[PDB]
Amino acid sequence: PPPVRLFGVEGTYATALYQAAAKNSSIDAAFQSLQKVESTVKKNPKLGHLLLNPALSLKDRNSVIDAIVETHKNLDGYVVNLLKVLSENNRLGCFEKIASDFGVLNDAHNGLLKGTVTSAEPLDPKSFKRIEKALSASKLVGQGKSLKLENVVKPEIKGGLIVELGDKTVDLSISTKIQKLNKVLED
Amino acid sequence: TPITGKVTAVIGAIVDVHFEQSELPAILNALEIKTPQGKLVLEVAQHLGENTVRTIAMDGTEGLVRGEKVLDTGGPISVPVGRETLGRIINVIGEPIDERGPIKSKLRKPIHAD
Amino acid sequence: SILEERIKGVSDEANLNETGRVLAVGDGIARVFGLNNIQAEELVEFSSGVKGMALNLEPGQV
Numbered sequence: 001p002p003p004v005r006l007f008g009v010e011g012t013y014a015t016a017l018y019q020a021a022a023k024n025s026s027i028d029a030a031f032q033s034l035q036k037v038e039s040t041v042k043k044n045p046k047l048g049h050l051l052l053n054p055a056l057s058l059k060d061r062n063s064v065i066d067a068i069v070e071t072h073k074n075l076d077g078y079v080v081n082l083l084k085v086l087s088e089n090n091r092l093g094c095f096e097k098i099a100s101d102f103g104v105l106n107d108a109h110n111g112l113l114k115g116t117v118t119s120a121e122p123l124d125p126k127s128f129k130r131i132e133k134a135l136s137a138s139k140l141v142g143q144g145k146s147l148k149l150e151n152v153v154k155p156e157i158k159g160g161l162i163v164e165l166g167d168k169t170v171d172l173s174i175s176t177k178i179q180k181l182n183k184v185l186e187d
Numbered sequence: 188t189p190i191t192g193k194v195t196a197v198i199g200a201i202v203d204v205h206f207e208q209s210e211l212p213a214i215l216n217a218l219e220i221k222t223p224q225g226k227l228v229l230e231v232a233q234h235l236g237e238n239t240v241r242t243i244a245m246d247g248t249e250g251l252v253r254g255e256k257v258l259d260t261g262g263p264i265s266v267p268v269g270r271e272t273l274g275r276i277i278n279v280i281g282e283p284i285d286e287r288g289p290i291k292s293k294l295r296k297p298i299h300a301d
Numbered sequence: 302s303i304l305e306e307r308i309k310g311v312s313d314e315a316n317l318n319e320t321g322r323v324l325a326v327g328d329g330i331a332r333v334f335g336l337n338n339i340q341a342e343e344l345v346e347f348s349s350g351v352k353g354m355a356l357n358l359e360p361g362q363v
Contacts, residue, residue: 044305046312054361055313055334058237059209063311071304090237214327233327241327 004108006101010094014101017082018109026076027106033075034099040071052093061087112146115165120157120173127151131163140166190259192238194220197251200244202229204257211238215299217264218242220257224250228264228280245279263299267292321363323347336363 002015021027042048047064050056056064065087069080086092107114117123117131132149135141149165160173192206204218212218212231219226227246235241266281271291275283283290315322321335331353336345344352345363355363 040304041308044308047308050312055317057209060311060313064308067304067307067311070307234325236324236326 002105004105006104010091010097011101013082013086013098014105017078017098017102018105021076021078022109024076024078026078027102027109030076030079031099031103031106033072034079034102037068037072038096038099041068051095054090054093056090056092058088058090061090061092064092110146111144112148113141113165115141115147115149115163117149117151117161117163118154118157119151119161120154120159120175122153123151123161135163135165140168188259188261192257192259193254194251194257195239195253197248197253200248201241202244202248202251203235203239203241204229206238206240206257206259209238212240212259212261215263217260217262218257219260220255222251222255228260230263263297265295265297266290267295269293324362332362334362337361339363 002018005011006014008015017030018027021030041051047067051064062084065083068083074080086095086098115135117128128149128151132147135147135149141147147165157173158175158178160175160177162169162171162173162176188210189208190206190210190212191208192204194202195205196203202220204220206212211234214231214234216231218229218231220229224246227244227248229242229244229246231240232243233241266277267290269291271293274285275287275290276285277290278284281290315335317335318337319339321333321337323331323333325332331347333345336355339345339355339358341358342354342356344354346352357363
């Protein structure tokens with residue numbers, strides 16, 4: 001069974017898919033192809049917006065799948081059997097929901113963690129590396145559990161940064177420090 | 188009718204049918220489900236959509252295998268009436284259960300009326 | 302390409318702003334999908350010549 005539980009929430013699809021395609025060892029292929037057919041499906045404006053929309057019927061949905069399997073073939077036929085299942089289950093809006101989850105499971109099997117350096121500005125390459133180094137140096141990123149560290153720029157945060165990974169965050173931002181400082185100087 | 192379906196569910200005497208076409212009955216239309224209990228006459232009361240109605244069953248339910256064909260007989264069923272309804276005790280179907288045998292139709296009228 | 306062409310073909314092709322198509326119905330109460338621009342407490346003329354006022358606007362389904 002899956003090495004990690006996302007506690008379903010349409011992660012139940014991802015889980016089922018994960019173990020089935022894990023024993024078929026065709027999860028990387030599935031994921032990439034799934035991404036690829038999704039990118040061009042999303043970029044078909046009708047049924048890249050209306051695919052999300054639940055306008056479509058059971059019968060109309062099935063005909064959408066037939067168009068989708070024209071868009072690519074192979075690269076795990078368990079995700080092709082999934083397409084049918086999803087149209088039948090009439091959910092195709094939480095399709096990318098499942099895609100995201102499947103990616104997490106897939107890269108969990110690979111043993112890769114995704115962290116983030118939410119910040120108010122795009123930081124130095126020195127900073128990027130130093131944080132990536134720091135995280136590996138800490139046991140927080142253990143070995144065989146890789147790091148993709150993505151610094152993001154968010155305007156809502158005003159100065160400083162919060163590093164997050166392992167559901168442990170160290171938030172050394174100015175916004176948060178300011179919040180406590182302001183509060184005590186209003187109290 | 189090409190309005191045929193199968194019986195998706197039988198939750199009590201409130202059967203659900205799934206018509207295989209996007210041609211649907213209407214509300215207060217009538218269906219005859221052919222069963223080894225003869226015809227069972229049901230009346231569509233809700234459309235739960237996606238060509239799956241929820242139907243009040245006006246003839247008793249039991250022993251029903253799921254996925255049993257339906258045919259749409261339309262409207263509120265029309266019984267057969269006359270002055271030959273007089274001296275007849277009739278079941279829901281409209282059949283003489285005092286068993287003088289079938290009522291001589293003159294006017295057959297829909298069970299639901301305005 | 303061929304995918305996009307077939308996608309164009311199988312798309313419903315109804316704007317559904319200011320109109321919308323029924324999808325539940327029973328009890329003199331219904332739920333329609335569409336009617337994106339619709340006034341509240343408005344009277345809506347069903348194509349079977351019924352009129353119904355609208356009291357619930359829910360995302361996508363009036």
